[PDB]
Design a protein around this nucleic acid. Structure first.
Lengths: 49, 102, 40
RNA sequence: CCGGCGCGCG
DNA sequence: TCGCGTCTCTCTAAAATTGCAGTCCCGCGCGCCGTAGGAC
DNA sequence: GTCCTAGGACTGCAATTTTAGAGAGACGCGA
């Protein structure tokens, strides 16, 4: 409603995906770190991408 | 394609649309845009909102056909039973679109 | 199945596309099965 | 030289 | 002389359950049992 | 003896099953 031509869809999708990736990695890393499992961020970022 | 005109296109040529119909479509798409930006971006508010949308008991049966004669008595009955055989503008312009204006 | 094969053989796919598009536009210009018919 | 059922090992 | 809520359906838009479709670690060893049915 | 011989647990989802919503042609009653 604020932005019309693709800056509505482009920026909306960009903001949603950027926020989703941050929380998706945090939730997965939080589960494994609670169990003492050590996995690099690269491996999870490959899956989330 | 049976039509030789469709030769060249991928999924046949565009369908025939008269210049009169194309102008009407462009008039409609413009006003659906104007109505959209009204809700996103007081007695004057309702009168323009209604204006944009407007740019789109046996006697009740008469609207299904052309209403030939009818009116006095039993004519409506005979016709219904025989019909089965065939079977503010100065304020609207104050808004402005900005499509393509980066 | 013979009737089905005959129906499939004489189909005009371009007419199918045009009729589907025009019906989709008619539905849009007018909410569960009003959408499910569109998805069809 | 094919599949089911039962029993096991890591 | 029609007019009036309305009797009895009437057809479809919109949810609301509801019956499939799909899936459910890996790698080894051994044994047993199939292969059925009927008028001769 | 036998030799041929013909019933989980969860998720996802479109399919029935309504529920409703208005709605109308003929109409018994009625003005």
């Amino acid at each position: 409603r604020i932005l019309g031509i693709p800056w509505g869809f482009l920026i909306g999708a960009e903001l949603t995906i950027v926020q989703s990736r941050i929380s998706l990695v945090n939730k997965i890393q939080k589960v494994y770190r609670s169990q003492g499992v050590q996995i690099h961020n690269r491996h999870i970022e490959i899956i989330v991408r | 394609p049976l039509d030789p005109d469709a030769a060249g296109f991928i999924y046949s040529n565009p369908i025939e649309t008269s210049f009169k119909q194309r102008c009407l479509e462009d008039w409609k798409v413009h006003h659906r845009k104007l109505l959209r930006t009204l809700q996103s971006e007081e007695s004057d508010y309702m009168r323009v909102m209604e204006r944009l949308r407007n740019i789109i008991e046996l006697k009740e049966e008469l609207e299904a056909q052309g209403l030939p004669i009818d009116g006095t008595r039993n004519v409506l009955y005979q016709r219904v039973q025989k019909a089965r055989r065939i079977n503010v503008d100065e304020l609207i312009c104050r808004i402005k679109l900005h499509e393509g204006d980066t | 199945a013979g009737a089905i094969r005959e129906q499939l053989a004489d189909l005009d796919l371009r007419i199918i596309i045009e009729n589907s598009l025009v019906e989709w536009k008619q539905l849009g210009e007018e909410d569960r099965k009003i959408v499910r018919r569109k998805d069809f």
